Amino acid sequence: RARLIRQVTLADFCEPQAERPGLVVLALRHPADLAGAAYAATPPGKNHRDLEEAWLALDRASVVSLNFLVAAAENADDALRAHVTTNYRDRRTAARLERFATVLRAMIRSHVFPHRALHVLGGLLGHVTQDRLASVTCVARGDQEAARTNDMAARRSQVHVPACALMDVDRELRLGGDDGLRFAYLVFVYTQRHRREALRVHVAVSRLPELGDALSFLLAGTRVDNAIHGTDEADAPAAPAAAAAFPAYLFNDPRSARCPTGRLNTPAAEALPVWAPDMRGRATRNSCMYAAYVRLGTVERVVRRALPLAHMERFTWDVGAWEECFF
Amino acid sequence: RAPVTDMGNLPQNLFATRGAPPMLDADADDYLRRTVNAGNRLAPVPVFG
Amino acid sequence: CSTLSLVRFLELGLSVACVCTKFPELSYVAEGTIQFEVQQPMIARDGPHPADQPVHNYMIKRLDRRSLNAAFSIAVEALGLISGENLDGTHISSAMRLRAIQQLARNVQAVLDSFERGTADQMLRVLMEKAPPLSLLAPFTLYEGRLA
Amino acid sequence: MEVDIALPTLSPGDLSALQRCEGRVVFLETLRRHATLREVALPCGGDVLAAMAAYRRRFAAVITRVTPHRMLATPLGVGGRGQSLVLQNTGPFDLTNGDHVCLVPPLLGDECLRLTSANLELRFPMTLPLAQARELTARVVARAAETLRGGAPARGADVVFSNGRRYQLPPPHRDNAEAATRSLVLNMIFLLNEGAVILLSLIPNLLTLGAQDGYANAVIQLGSATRELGQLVRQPPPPLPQDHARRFCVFEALEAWIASASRLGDTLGTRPVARVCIFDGPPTVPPGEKAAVVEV
Amino acid sequence: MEVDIALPTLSPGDLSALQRCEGRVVFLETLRRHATLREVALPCGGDVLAAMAAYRRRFAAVITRVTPHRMLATPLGVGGRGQSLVLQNTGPFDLTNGDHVCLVPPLLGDECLRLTSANLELRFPMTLPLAQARELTARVVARAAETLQLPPPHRDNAEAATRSLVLNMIFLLNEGAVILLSLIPNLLTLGAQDGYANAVIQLGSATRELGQLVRQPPPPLPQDHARRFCVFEALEAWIASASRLGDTLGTRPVARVCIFDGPPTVPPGEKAAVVEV
Amino acid sequence: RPAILPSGQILSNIEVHSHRALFDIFKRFRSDDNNLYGAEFDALLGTY
Amino acid sequence: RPAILPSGQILSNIEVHSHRALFDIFKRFRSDDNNLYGAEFDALLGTY
Amino acid sequence: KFFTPAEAVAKSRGLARLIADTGAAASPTSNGEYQFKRPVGAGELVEDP
What we know:
- With 49 residues, chain B is mostly helical.
- Chain B contains 1 helix and no strands.
- Chain B is elongated and about 50 Å long.
- In chain D, α4 (182-202) runs antiparallel to α6.
- Chain D is elongated.
- Chain H: It comes from Suid herpesvirus 1.
């Protein structure tokens, strides 16, 4: 059998009566520490309190359904926007979606990436709701349909993913392979251009155990235009001094100036060559971050069928750790 | 039964709110906040959010 | 050691408030409804006022669903004694088995009784949610048929 | 696969203290159905690097119920279907629902049972969520490093948040933080510097490219296909005859660096050992209080 | 799940040799329930670097039974972490209890159950403990970096290894990393008053050769040295990288050895229980 | 909620997936889908 | 440690957590804790 | 609740509805040491003519 999680929370982001069971839910970090870590994490030149403001503009609430998050990104098919807007019961919902979009766009600008703010839980199956207070329940290991929903029309369930975001890889990369058991990865796509940036979401399945080079080639344009426009707003100095050239000719020189060990002080250390490695404004790793992914589980089949959707087949929940994709 | 609430006095303090444009001179606003919070109850606690 | 006073709902005086029926298929039922039809009387008033015809109306009502839940645990090394996987073919372990069985029995009698006070509380909870205050009802039923 | 530990009877009073640690983890040696308490013991004042390296050659196991006769443990590595189990959180800050825990030695000020009747000590490693641990290690190391160069000894920003409350990161001199962590900061800073030096020696003109148009272009070309700007690594000068007292073969140094870096990266944990799946309880477990967990 | 490998008709000269391969691992490509033997097969030995790069792109499988018609298998890790199975060791160093094992392509070749009737050959990878597999990968990748019991590289894929290595190294250089780079002499002087401090530094250290040859000036204060602090960020980045540098060149440790009764150390050529990770 | 008892048998034996044009809705499950079992219903409970 | 055969029943129930002051030791566990089922004794085997 | 007509915007199906609304309203105030806006989750019953 499978193991479950129950987390009482607010009905703002995931609204378990509006959707039917079988869709992945995410856990949202407490925003206080995000706002704090920004103060030290936003790069030079940029704003260092804009995430504070972006959060304050959206006023515990802990979960967020992927069905909701995918809408508040660049990539989305407007049918799903219309569904989320007109099918969610809740007041003021479209405004909240707009504010959440602004929040995530601030998150990437402040170099505190949302993948460090959204751990992933399993697919919800049950809920009891008071007035604007819910208690969702999702699987955590094992296969989905080992559960037992209190619908009584369909005791078991499946896993539903918005087909607008599901990006297949193998048939995409043309591996010539034959569909057997394939993994499932939820991937994020960052893009960094100051005041003009966005986030793209996808759900990727393939046989590839190690994404790496696969995404590095899949998202080539993103990495390209992100490495060059990413260092912007950082004052780089003038042309680098010739002293910056780290001297290599001097390693296996038999005759060269040398220093007795333990005497880097005032005594005759002057004749040593000077070398000033000075790196101020070049592309750091967080500057070239473009994607992040995390393993979800294993899958048999994907069929498309209805608002467009994508029913999984024998999903086995096995959540992994996050991963960076910068090189 | 006996009133579950007190019936005494507790003046509200609006400096625990938002939505008001602060005055131009920052010294004036800091002086107003430092004089209104002169032992007045409940208004500030300097912890964010 | 203390005993536990049981309470039977229908033994109380409150039971006359609600008619209760067992319905072992309620989990299957979606939105269920009950109907109403009523025929008001009329008097043939003499005069220029248009003599009103006998009025008819048709009214229904929608069910509301609630639940009740209580939970009780059991000890891990008590499980090995109830089942026997941790039982030894000795003379002590029988005493521990008797003690664990007694504990589980007392506990389950406690919880299985809680559903009586549960309903006796739910009845007051719902009966208090509809009843308007008498101050605002005694004169209202005195101005009937005139609120036009 | 549940092991029991013989317990050399100590005393009253102390046995209560041993009963209080009914949730922590202990590192066995081999999977045998018997073991003596003298075996699972470490001098609670010890080197953090060596302890973190030894945590790999052992098996984790949590202390279930204890009795004056013996105490029962349950290993975490091997297992059937990954059954549930209870765990006493003992880190400095709480851990939420639905995340991964990691086992690190008591990096900050230490707590250790002192069983004065049996004359042995115990160390119970901290239980940290993944990212917070990977960042706390860097925090303590960076503070020690800033201290090393005798610069500004304080910046008022050695603090870590977790679910609102601000944590203080106790002062780094309490038990032996100036001695039981020196090994770690040395072994990390040194390797970092060595990697940087090797890279710069293989590509001498890296830091003399365009401040914004050359370095970025080189990195993007390197990440992309095989252009590589020719042998971007210029041919290093030819070495000495390996008896001259100043021989330096760069490639063997790169080899040693790869090996040492891999080894250091593996002896740091950061591979989850469990995952909190609490259910029917307060969704946020504070320090010192037990929390339902399923092994990974 | 139990992968089923079907067999063609075999001569008794090699069926009995295949029977002896009851605890070795093979590499499928897709996880269908059925698969023919011809599919799961690798060419004769060549380019240990390329092969080691190929093990990453496929998930392993260990075999258990060999019948005159049918040969079972078990997909190593796709959803399980405690499926205790047995696999025999074929690496030179004897692996002891406690430590993990990693799959490494074979050296010198010569390990090929060359089947003539079926006209194919298999190369089962050897199994080494982690501590030595890391070192072997280090040696091979360094040798590949040299070309701008030992087979020579091929200059077509060695560049890919060099690329991965140089990327993982380049992204260590940070405006905080220079601050650390500034105290090399302050580190050497510390590696003199004590013994352990000197012990942690190697002999051909490739840094002591620098701290005694070049002086560097005080570092330039970075932009906004009041709001943020850089050394912490550089160190966190380096931890994140080094935690995943070993696998990106070799292969993650696939299983750890646990034995309940037998003698601790198991010699080469002898089966030993295991649990996967 | 499929049919309970059929009225008349069928005689033609033909691949049906290739002929989905003639039909209005057409659903093919693989083998013993766990969905065709649960039965929910609506109800009216007494009339006054 | 717990009792085996109760002697006298209690006629009147009351909230116990209110009147902690009347009692000298006080232990209130949620439901079926782990200590109750420990039968671990110790005694001298022989004397001489 | 004296200057906000958004509640009065809600039409009255009949005087009986407004009657029934009294005596069953939800409490807007908290139950702490002060009178704070209450977290809308828990709620409770309160009458106010």
